[PDB]
Each structure stands twice: as structure tokens, then as C-alpha cells.
Design a protein that fits this description.
This is part of a larger assembly, with seven protein chains of seven kinds. By secondary structure, chain C is mainly α. Helix content of chain C is 52%, strand content 7%. A two-stranded antiparallel sheet of chain C has the order 1-2. Chain C is globular and about 55 Å long. By secondary structure, chain G is α+β, with helices and mostly antiparallel strands. The chains are: A alpha+beta, B alpha+beta, C mainly alpha, D alpha+beta, E alpha+beta, F mainly alpha, G alpha+beta. At the B-G interface, loops of B face loops of G. The structure holds one RNA strand. Chain D: Belongs to the universal ribosomal protein uS19 family.
RNA sequence: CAACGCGAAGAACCUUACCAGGUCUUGACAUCCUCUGACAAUCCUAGAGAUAGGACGUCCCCUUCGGGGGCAGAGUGACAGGUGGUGCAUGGUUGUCGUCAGCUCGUGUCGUGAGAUGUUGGGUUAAGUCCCGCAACGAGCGCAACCCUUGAUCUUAGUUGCCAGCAUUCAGUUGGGCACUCUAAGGUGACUGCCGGUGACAAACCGGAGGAAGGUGGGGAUGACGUCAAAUCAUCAUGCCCCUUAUGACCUGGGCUACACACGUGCUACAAUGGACAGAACAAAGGGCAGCGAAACCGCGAGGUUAAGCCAAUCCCACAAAUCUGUUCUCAGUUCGGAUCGCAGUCUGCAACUCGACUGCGUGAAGCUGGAAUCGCUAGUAAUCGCGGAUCAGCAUGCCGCG
């Protein structure tokens, strides 16, 4: 019944979480077929392992935008701010590892005279 | 090459488009219509000096205001020529028009009028030094915060063109908070073409 | 100018054994995520079957056997192009060892990538790899030109 | 290349069918190198403009589906 | 039905007010100016009405005194003053000048002679005070 | 030879293909914009001068 | 009833739309709030020089904003009141 | 460097200027003059222009109806037209050093004068940034800030968006409601602000606490005096030169796409971190009315047919790809690679031959990581993955932008 907001990279996750057993799900569909890789199934359980609220809570998230790590980071930062609004007594401990810092890792604007974002065209005398 | 135009940079953030109306699916012919109507007033009222014109398209009936102070004689006994020019405008635009005239106080520090002036005595063959120097002192006597004037071309020395300027006060083009007003005018003489540019800084915008 | 260094892709902080560290993160210098990690896991497994003991244990033993301590840099002094050896910083050490591991992993040329990296893990745990070979090559050449400093 | 028929310009048609109707013999002039060949102009001769000069060419039986521009090379070489 | 045209005065049933026809966008859809509004109106919704068939903040004085100042400063503001007199429609005006240097006293009178609006400039009469005024009249 | 061809531009040709677009403010045949029927240099001039009621200089 | 208004500058849209809202609320009508619809950009791209250097360019756009207002009850007895008003030519009014 | 996927953000005719041929001369066209006075349109004959004759064929509006105005035709003479050169006559433009921190001036001193001092010295900064000195004292263009966007939050407003607690669906679909997201306005926030330390205490510098953000947060815009006699007479214009029996017009066709070679910039490959086949997903940003065109049906496919909706946060473009899971291929000039060709078609357009793109076929090239060399790139970057837009009948590996 506890709420958080998660934005990572053109991808905003609205997460509401309730006490539970650790059932993890998005858009009433299981993660394991929605994200297949364990390197992003670690994202959900990583903050609730650096703190101790691992098995007492389960999460319900609505998500839009970006690519797979794109909402993976969004999930992460959403459950982060959710646990800050839950028990902010370990706010300091969570801040020490970070994960509340909104990462400025968005795509850069393509600029004229260039290919991509920084690559100059091939140049010779 | 050169700089960007200060007022082109300041369009939409400090400056008005002077074409405030909106068209959609008639944008094109509406737009070229504002060009030829501006051409008509520009080469008709060149005697009494015009700087800028704002066009309104309220209910597609065109609406015009015209600036500057010397058309105080256009406003006066020349209500007849106001009516006649407006009849020619409705002859040109299909749907009719209504015009207004706005007096300008301190017409000395308006860029269009300055540039037209310098082009005029350059056609009248005063020295460019004299022209620029009296005009700049006249503006900063009028109260302008800073004025720089330009001239380029065959400045008497037909065998090699060059450029000349004088400026004092402060002219902060790099600051976008500044109010700048830019003109260019093209003085034609027997030597060919002589270019006039002028811009006026008139304090910042809070 | 100004020396900077930065963390990248480190795993979860607490109870980070190196096996879970490279199970969840780490190394992964093959390209993009996906067809870089799966394959690494398969290589890691095909050596538990080969030697029935700890995969990460033999993996860091292989890394240890790859670890150099001397690396040479060239100099412009003199018209004979002398080269001077320096001590390798540990971050440079691990990234450079892992670099040679991956490059003759893809160079060693077996039928597929997982058995390629698997045989490289075996041939670096034992001292019969091309990377071990070049390790001793730079070691002995640094010992040869060590007189300069 | 479309099944609404091959494309020609009408005026050259009218003269060439009246030509092969009454008297097959002499040559026909054109400036249009664009017309698709029809299989009923076998045996005649056409002076086709190449851009610089009118060139005669003979139409055989197998000359079907082409255009008359295939035979007046506009550009030369060594 | 009626053969409606652009510019026809017309009322819409759904809004009940008088308006003006502009154009026909569809087989039975038109563009209608209703007052300031521009509703796309279907043809069953229209009912026919009729078919197609300054500055004032100023007052201007009748005289001007121009004593003790510059030539090329003044002629900017005597051209302005003549334009103001036309806006108020004065047939006659005067510009009082100085005596000593006298350059502008002879200088202004040549400008009005070639000015596009003034026909003449004349000195005063004995009943007015003589050379205490010099008069100007316009076209 | 510039101005015969713009006369060719307003007066209609014989086929629907031949109506190549032009800008009549300045007669460049290349690089006109359909939204304004206006090409590059004479677009930029009046664009900095103030018209085209909604154009501003981009920065993002 | 619905009304749709759009123009290039939200400094005309703000007080025009607020003036319409306040006129409706002072008149006898039920009217909700103006929802600011998403602005869209038509980016134009144009060369600097006349002849060469296509590696030089400038970017222009056509920022036009749209606000959306509905009247809840139809209120014919005050459509004349919200009809008589006028807005400048800068903004187009749509139902 | 600072020319070379450059003008040209699109050459079948047009564009187009160039060439061959066929044409015309107050003319493609503009202002006037003098008459007919409203006028040309439209279809047949040869016929590319254009001519020849007919058909409504030269027919408007104000007119105290006298005559005027518009709007053409005919004729004429002043004229018109020049992408006909000269960026070394030029205006207006643009690149370049260089986003480098420099560039200068007023007044006063010193020299005689050229000039100097300010602007040097100590310290500091991304910075002529700042501080302290100092015969300089100040000032300006500069730099920074002010603008836009991107990062965190408050209030307002909840529909064409959202679905939280609700009830019901194939789907927020509905019934409901702005909670949340979002939309976009107004705002709040970061300023060495604070602490500790170094530094003369000065300017700063270092580390912390806070903080979404910390030391100009990131990115954009913004280009000083000037240099290259840089380029642009293809927007503009004295100057000479072109003629009206042509360097000016019209028309058709060709050329701008050629080909023994070389250079540049890109694309695609040389493969098993792969290829083929099946399945499962997950974006942003734009466009759409002589337009986008749904679903459905036909066709293997390009596409075709009747066609729903949408002037759009409703509808359409529009099924994103890379990715992941599984099966197979088993290291080869290959189920790699697809070049070039033959055949049959699709779309557009008067027209696809020179000279368009696409589809189904068959054929299948070289090429098994590239010498001397040489380039880009400090993190959402590089590298890869697709997706839009302009230009537009049809045509994009190029450009711009998006994730």
C-alpha cells in the first residue's frame, strides 16, 4: 500500500508495494519471462538485500518506456524511494550506497556536422 | 563569418513577430501576402519613413498598424491618402483591410529610421565620417544606452572597398537580456553599392 | 590532464565472494550484455566437469599464473630507441591480464567460444597458454632491458 | 512495364498504320525515341532522333517489347 | 436543399446563432464562421439566413520659439512640428528665432521653401510687432 | 537567363508532372519549403527580420 | 460544450484561456479546468552560407501550444455571453 | 587543413544553364503610347513548338446613360530581357583559426620619436576568472551570468492521458475518479550556501555534511579585434560588354548518369560471440486533407479491391529492431557473402531506353580481416540496433533528428 516513483532513462515506473513474501511482478506479469537475465533480476533484490526488508514485502509496478535495463534502473530507483517513504530510518545507510541519486545517464542529442553524437566524419588532408 | 542578427536571436523571447496572427493550411499564401503588402507600404510611404508594421488577421479581415512619427502628416490632411492607400490595399488583398497609424516618440533611436537616414545623406554625398558621427551623437543625446554604426563598400576609394565604424557606451550583443534593434539599409551611389548597418542598445529587459 | 579513476559494474556490496561477484557481474569484456554473459557462464561451467573442483578457484589460479609484475615502455632519448621497464600498478595488472585472456581466448581457434574460453581457463590454470607464453616473454625481455632505469 | 498496355505517342501511330496500309515502302521520320515497338511494324524503316542526327534502322520480326531508343546510341566512345 | 455559397449568412441549429459560411470541406460538411468561432458544421445542421450580396492624444500649438540653440538639432524638430500642425490642420504657423548669429534664422527659411508641405514663409507686419514674428503657411 | 523560367513556373505547363516548385520571393528552384513556399536565403532573411509568425531559433 | 484554442505563444494562451474560464464561471455555466494539451514542434533545418560549407547549419522550430476547455452543461442562456467576447488574431478558436 | 554524400533538403521531360535540330523578333516579360474595346478560353485538321479554318467565340462594372473605370486584344516607339564576365569594384552573406582569452579605448605619466605603462609582478581560475601589489586611474568588445533543454520537488488543470482503492470487460472496455503516471504552465530549488582544514587573514584550493543534482550539474544557443585580396556577380548592383535578322525567347530529343585509371567520403561483407527457422517481448520522436489511409478480402510477394476513422494526447502512418528462449547447420569460399547478369512482375508518372525504385525467381562474384600509412572517440560516450522527418508523382547507403 506504499508508493514510490522510479525514473531511469526515458522510462518511468510507478511502484506500489505491500507487505508480502517477495513476489516480484510488473504489469500483472512475471519478471522472469519479461526480463530474462539474472544480471537484471538482481536489480530488484539488491536494495532489499543491502537492507534487511527482503522477504517481508512484495512489489506491484506499472511501467512504461525505454529498454530492458531502462526500466530495470527505474524499478530500482522506484523501490528505493518507496522504502524511503516506508522506513526512512535507514535513509543514511541506503544513501551511503546511493541509489537515490537520479542518474543523468540519458541519451545525448545528435548534433549537426557529426554522425551519432561525437563521431566526426573521416578526415584527411 | 559574421554574427547572428541580435533581433533574430531575440525573436520570441523578448521580441514580437509583428505578424502575431495564426494561419494553418492557409499559412503559405497568407505569408507571401504579408510580404507583398509590406513591399507596397515600403515603396509607397518611403517619403514619410516607416520602420515596422504589425499585421493582424482578425476573422481573416486583415488589420494593420504602422509606426513612426513623420506620418503625422499622413494622419492629418492626408486622411484622403490614407483612404486611397487603404482602397488599394483592399484592391490587393481580396478581403478588405483596416489600418491604424501609431506615432513614435524619440524616432531618432529607431534602427530603420537611422539606417534610412544614413543611406539618404550617403546618396546626398556627405562624408561618411560626418554622417555617422552626427547620427551617433544624436542618438546618445536622445538617451540610447549604446550605439554602434556600420558602413562598408567603396568609401570613396573605388579601387578597394573597406569598412568603418564608431561606437561608445556599451553594446552587449552577447547578453540576451539586452534589448537590441537592428537595421540594414543599402545606399546606392554612382560608385555602385554602399552598405549601411546600425544597431542600438537601449538598456536591459528585467 | 589530471589522473582520474572510476568504478564500473561492481556487484552487490555485502557477502561478495568472487564467484557470486562474477556470477552477477564483472569481467564481461566481450561486447554487450547478452551473448557475452551467457557464454561466459557456459565456459565457466565446462571446467567444473573437466576438473571436479571450484570454478572460481581455478579461475583466479589461472589469473594468478597470468599476473605479470614488469612492463616496459619506450623512450625517445638517444638515437637508438631505448626501452625502460616500470612496475605495473595493480589495476593495470588485472585489466591487462584479463585483456590477454580474452584476446587469445578468441584467437586460440576451436569450434566454438565456450570450449575456447574453457580450454583457455585450463591452459592458464596450468602454465601452457599463449597468454602465459607472452607473460614470460615480456617478463624475460623486461629482465633483459632492466639495466636502463 | 505495366499491364495497361505499352505506351506510344498517337500521332506517329496514325501515320505508320496508314503507311503500312497503303504503301509499305518509304521511311518515316520521328523525334520521339520513346514509343514501345508494336509487332505490326515488321519490315519498315524509322529515322529516329538520337539527340543530334536522325538515324535509320530496320525492324525485324524479333524486335518486340523494346523501344526505338535502344538502337540510337546517344553517346559514343573509343 | 439550398445551393449554399462561401460568404453566406447562416445559422447552426446546435448553437442557435447567426454566422457566416466559409467553405465546404466534405460532401455534406462546411466550415462556418459563427461570430469568432470556426465550427466545422454538417450540412443538415445549417439553416439559411442570407446569401452573399489614428492618434488622438495630442494638441498642437500655433507658434514656436527657437532661440539660442543649434542648427541641425532644430531642423529635426521643425519638420516634426510642421507634421504636427498638419495633424491639427493649421493653415498658418510661426517659428520665433534668434538675432545674433542668424545662421539658423536664414537657414530654416530655405528648408521650408523646398519643403513638400509649405508654400511660403514670411516676415511679420507692423500691426503684429514687425520683426518680432516670422510666419509660415502650408499647402 | 533567370526570369523566363519563373514565367514558365507560374504559367501552366501541359502535364501534371512539370509543375516543379519554386519560391517567388527569390527565384531559387532548389530547397524550397512546402510549409511556406519559400527557399533558404530569402527564408532566413525575413525569418530573422520577424515574419513567419511562429518561428524561433532552436536550442536543445 | 467543448472549446479548443491553440497558438504559438503561451503568454497569449494563459490569459486568453483564463479570461474565457473566468467569463464562463461568472456567467451561468458549469465549466471545468483548462487541460494543457501537449505542445508539438516542427523543427526546420537550414544551411548558413549561400554556396558551400554544408557542415554549417541552423535549427528553427514552430512551437505552438494548445489548451483544451469544456463546458459541462450546454448553457444556451450564456452562449451569447461567451459568444460576444473576442480574442486577438494570434489564437484560433475551435469548438 | 579551412574543396571533394559540396550548392544539389532528390536531373526520365521540367529542373537545365549545355548540345543537335526545328523556330520568333517591342519580344518569355514589365512600364507607358494609339486604337478595338472586357476578354482569352475550350474541341476537331496536319501538328513538338506553332500555323489554318470553324464553334460560345472576343460577350465586364459604374453610368443626371453624355461618358468613364476595369481587363484584355491589336498595332507602335521609347524599352524589356540577360545563370553574357569581373568576390581583385561591390553590398548582403558564410567558413577558418577559435569558443582561443585575448583584443582595445578615454584621461594621465615617461620617452622626443617609434612607443611604453593600463593589459606587467606575487598568488589563483575553464577564463584579461579573481585577489594582493604596482604610475597608473578607469572604461569597452570580450569571459561568466541572463535564454532553451535535461536532471529533484510544490501548486494549478484532469481529457482524446492515467487506473489507486472499487464493480464489471477481449481490452479503463465501461460505470466511476484525478489517486499515480503524464501533459504544461506557474513555481521551488545550488549559490562555495554551511562545516573542517590548507592558504596572510586576501583570492581561492582540499575534504565532508547535507543534498536529485557540488563546485560554470550535463548539453545546446552564443563566435571579439582581426587573418586567408578564402569563396559566393547563381539573392544584389554603377562598371564595361550581348542583341533584338541573338550571349534574348519557344519547342522536341539528347547531356548533366560516359570510362582505359586515380583520390576521397560512406555502405555491405569476409562468419559458429554466427547463419536459417519458430516463439516471446521492450522505445522515443515526428508526420498526415488534392493527406494519412484501418480492419477485412485477393495476390507468394512487391502490391491490388471495396473501403472504417482521423484537420488528430481519440484515427492513421506504425507489426520497432538489436535483445531473450528453443531447434538446426558443424568451420568450409560454406545454409558466409551477396556482386553482376537472364526470366516474369509491382508502383509512380504522357513516358522507367540513355535514365527510377521495388517484388518473385534462377544464377551465383570477389572477398577467409587487409602494406607503407592513417582517422574518430573521456561513459549513455564509443560501438552496434532500428525508427521518423525534409526534399516528394516515383527515387536516400546521403542529411537532419529520435530512442
Amino acid at each position: 500500500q506504499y508508493y514510490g516513483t522510479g525514473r531511469r532513462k526515458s522510462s518511468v515506473a510507478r511502484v506500489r508495494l505491500v507487505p508480502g513474501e517477495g513476489r516480484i511482478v510488473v504489469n500483472n506479469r512475471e519478471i522472469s519471462e519479461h526480463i530474462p537475465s539474472a544480471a537484471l533480476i538482481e536489480d530488484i533484490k539488491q536494495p532489499l538485500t543491502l537492507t534487511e526488508t527482503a522477504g517481508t514485502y512484495d512489489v506491484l509496478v506499472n511501467v512504461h518506456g525505454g529498454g530492458l535495463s531502462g526500466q530495470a534502473g527505474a524499478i530500482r530507483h522506484g523501490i528505493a524511494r518507496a522504502l524511503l517513504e516506508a522506513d526512512p530510518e535507514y535513509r543514511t545507510t541506503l544513501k551511503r550506497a546511493g541509489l537515490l541519486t537520479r542518474d543523468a545517464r540519458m541519451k545525448e542529442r545528435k548534433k549537426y556536422g557529426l554522425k551519432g553524437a561525437r563521431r566526426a566524419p573521416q578526415f584527411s588532408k | 563569418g559574421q554574427k547572428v542578427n541580435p533581433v533574430g536571436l531575440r525573436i520570441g523571447v523578448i521580441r514580437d513577430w509583428e505578424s502575431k496572427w495564426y494561419a494553418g493550411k492557409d499559412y503559405a499564401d497568407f505569408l507571401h501576402e504579408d510580404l507583398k503588402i509590406r513591399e507596397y507600404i515600403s515603396k509607397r510611404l518611403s517619403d514619410a519613413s516607416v520602420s515596422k508594421v504589425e499585421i493582424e488577421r482578425a476573422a481573416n479581415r486583415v488589420n494593420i498598424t504602422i509606426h513612426t512619427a513623420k506620418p503625422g502628416m499622413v494622419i492629418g490632411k492626408g486622411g484622403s491618402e490614407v483612404e486611397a492607400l487603404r482602397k488599394a490595399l483592399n484592391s490587393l488583398t481580396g478581403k478588405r483591410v483596416h489600418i491604424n497609424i501609431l506615432e513614435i516618440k524619440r524616432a531618432d533611436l529607431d534602427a530603420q529610421l537611422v539606417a534610412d537616414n544614413i543611406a539618404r545623406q550617403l546618396e546626398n554625398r556627405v562624408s561618411f565620417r560626418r554622417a555617422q558621427k552626427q547620427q551617433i551623437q544624436r542618438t546618445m543625446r536622445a538617451g540610447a544606452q549604446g550605439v554602434k554604426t556600420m558602413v562598408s563598400g567603396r568609401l570613396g576609394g573605388a579601387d578597394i572597398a573597406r569598412s568603418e565604424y564608431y561606437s561608445e557606451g556599451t553594446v552587449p550583443l552577447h547578453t540576451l537580456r539586452a534589448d537590441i534593434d537592428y537595421a540594414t539599409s543599402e545606399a546606392d551611389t554612382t560608385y555602385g553599392k554602399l552598405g549601411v548597418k546600425v544597431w542600438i542598445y537601449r538598456g536591459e529587459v528585467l | 590532464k589530471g589522473p582520474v579513476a572510476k568504478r564500473d559494474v561492481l556487484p552487490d556490496p555485502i557477502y561478495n565472494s568472487k564467484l557470486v561477484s562474477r556470477l552477477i557481474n564483472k569481467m564481461m569484456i566481450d561486447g554487450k550484455k547478452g551473448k557475452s554473459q551467457t557464454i561466459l557462464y557456459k565456459s565457466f561451467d565446462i571446467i567444473k566437469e573437466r576438473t571436479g573442483n571450484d570454478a572460481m578457484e581455478v579461475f583466479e589460479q589461472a589469473l594468478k599464473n597470468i599476473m605479470p609484475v614488469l612492463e616496459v615502455k619506450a623512450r625517445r632519448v638517444g638515437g637508438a630507441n631505448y626501452q625502460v621497464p616500470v612496475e605495473v600498478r595493480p589495476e593495470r595488472r588485472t585489466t591487462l591480464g584479463l585483456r590477454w585472456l580474452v584476446n587469445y581466448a578468441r584467437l586460440r581457434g576451436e569450434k566454438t567460444m565456450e570450449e575456447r574460453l574453457a580450454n583457455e581457463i585450463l591452459d592458464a590454470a596450468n602454465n601452457t597458454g599463449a597468454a602465459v607464453k607472452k607473460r614470460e616473454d615480456t617478463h624475460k625481455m623486461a629482465e633483459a632491458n632492466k639495466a636502463f632505469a | 512495364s505495366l499491364k495497361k498496355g505499352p505506351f506510344v505517342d498517337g500521332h506517329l501511330m496514325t501515320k505508320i498504320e496508314k503507311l503500312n496500309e497503303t504503301d509499305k515502302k518509304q521511311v518515316v521520320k520521328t523525334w520521339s525515341r520513346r514509343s514501345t515497338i508494336f509487332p505490326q511494324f515488321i519490315g519498315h524503316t524509322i529515322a529516329v532522333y538520337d539527340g543530334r542526327k536522325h538515324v535509320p534502322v530496320f525492324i525485324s520480326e524479333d524486335m518486340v517489347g523494346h523501344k526505338l531508343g535502344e538502337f540510337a546510341p546517344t553517346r559514343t566512345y573509343k | 436543399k439550398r445551393d449554399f455559397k462561401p460568404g453566406d449568412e447562416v445559422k447552426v441549429l446546435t448553437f442557435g446563432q447567426k454566422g457566416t459560411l466559409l467553405e465546404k470541406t466534405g460532401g455534406n460538411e462546411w466550415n462556418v464562421q459563427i461570430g469568432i468561432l470556426k465550427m466545422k458544421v454538417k450540412e443538415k445542421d445549417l439553416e439559411f439566413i442570407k446569401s452573399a450580396p489614428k492618434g488622438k492624444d495630442y494638441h498642437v500649438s500655433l507658434e514656436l520659439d527657437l532661440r539660442g540653440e543649434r542648427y541641425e538639432n532644430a531642423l529635426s524638430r521643425v519638420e516634426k512640428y510642421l507634421d504636427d500642425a498638419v495633424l491639427a490642420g493649421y493653415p498658418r504657423v510661426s517659428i520665433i528665432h534668434g538675432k545674433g548669429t542668424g545662421a539658423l534664422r536664414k537657414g530654416v527659411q530655405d528648408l521650408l521653401k523646398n519643403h513638400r508641405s509649405v508654400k511660403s514663409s514670411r516676415f511679420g507686419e507692423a500691426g503684429e510687432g514687425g520683426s518680432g514674428v516670422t510666419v509660415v503657411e502650408l499647402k | 537567363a533567370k526570369k523566363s523560367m519563373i514565367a514558365k513556373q507560374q504559367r501552366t505547363p501541359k502535364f501534371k508532372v512539370q509543375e516543379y516548385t519554386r519560391c517567388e520571393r527569390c527565384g531559387r528552384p532548389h530547397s524550397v519549403i512546402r510549409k511556406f513556399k519559400l527557399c533558404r536565403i530569402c527564408f532566413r532573411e525575413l525569418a530573422y527580420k520577424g515574419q513567419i509568425p511562429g518561428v524561433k531559433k532552436a536550442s536543445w | 460544450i467543448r472549446i479548443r484554442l491553440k497558438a504559438y505563444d503561451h503568454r497569449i494562451l494563459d490569459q486568453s484561456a483564463e479570461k474565457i474560464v473566468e467569463t464562463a464561471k461568472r456567467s451561468g455555466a458549469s465549466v471545468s479546468g483548462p487541460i494543457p494539451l501537449p505542445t508539438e514542434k516542427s523543427v526546420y533545418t537550414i544551411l548558413r552560407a549561400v554556396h558551400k560549407y554544408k557542415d554549417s547549419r541552423e535549427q528553427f522550430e514552430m512551437r505552438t501550444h494548445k489548451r483544451l476547455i469544456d463546458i459541462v452543461n450546454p448553457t444556451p442562456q450564456t452562449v451569447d455571453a461567451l459568444m460576444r467576447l473576442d480574442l486577438p488574431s494570434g489564437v484560433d478558436i475551435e469548438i
